[PDB]
Symmetry: C5
Subunit: 69 residues, 5 copies
């Protein structure tokens, strides 16, 4: 799966449908994997660099793959 955006998490958002949005770089991307919520908030709090891989690389696009560095 290709890299879409790499960077620090600017903000996260919990959605009415239980999905979770993350803003990294110039894109807001959303995931339906509940296990990733606490992991992503942890990366945001600690300032980790994350890479989000997705073929839906556009604002509002979905993802499931994330590299935490």
């Amino acid at each position: 799966t290709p890299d879409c955006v790499t960077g620090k998490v600017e903000y996260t958002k919990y959605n009415d449908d239980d999905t979770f949005t993350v803003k990294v770089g110039d894109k807001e991307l959303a995931t339906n994997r509940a296990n990733l919520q606490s992991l992503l908030l942890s990366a945001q709090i600690t300032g980790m660099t994350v890479t989000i891989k997705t073929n839906a690389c556009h604002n509002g696009g979905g993802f499931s793959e994330v590299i935490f560095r």
Copy 2:
């Protein structure tokens, strides 16, 4: 969904019905989303600014949408 309140979390409370209350600004709001409990307490401990979006913007109103900054 419109913004209701934005600010640091003053206190959180676990309710007898397993819902979770948060006090931000001048409003106590509650959520039935279990996944938000650990995320909100983490935001409270670390001093994050949160924005709660809800149409029930009154004391005791419910919500599901939260932006963590």
Copy 3:
């Protein structure tokens, strides 16, 4: 539900029946809500003040309501 004890968490204990005991103030109180375990240990580690509300305000009494401040 009336306030029972307010203070820092002195110690916590995981019980054989999966309930969880917290000592706050002059009382040991126990809860059967699994979701509260990680929340309470977090309060203990970070030194938060908690208020436990319960009508069984005696040693070994049960609770479900907790305010994290």
Copy 4:
């Protein structure tokens, strides 16, 4: 249940059968309670003193009762 060992956690280990081993003092003990995994690793990271209570107080013995101080 009698106290078995009190001390700081030296190391923890996740096992193939989903049990979790902890080395405290001179004993390696294991638990089948999944809820204790994140609580014990948190105690390990923060340097908390824990007391494990069990009648199987020997290497490889099981436990479920833990006091976090």
Copy 5:
């Protein structure tokens, strides 16, 4: 189960199939145990030394056993 790699966690990755990859030493290894995701990310953030034991000791190999030191 034999020791495969020991070292600090270089990066972690959440996979489309809900498995979780860790890079330690010269190998990426992945686990299907959900419970390990938060524990491994915590090890990564705090700089713990982990030892992964597995008989599939090759890049992309699976594992379930990990020692956190």
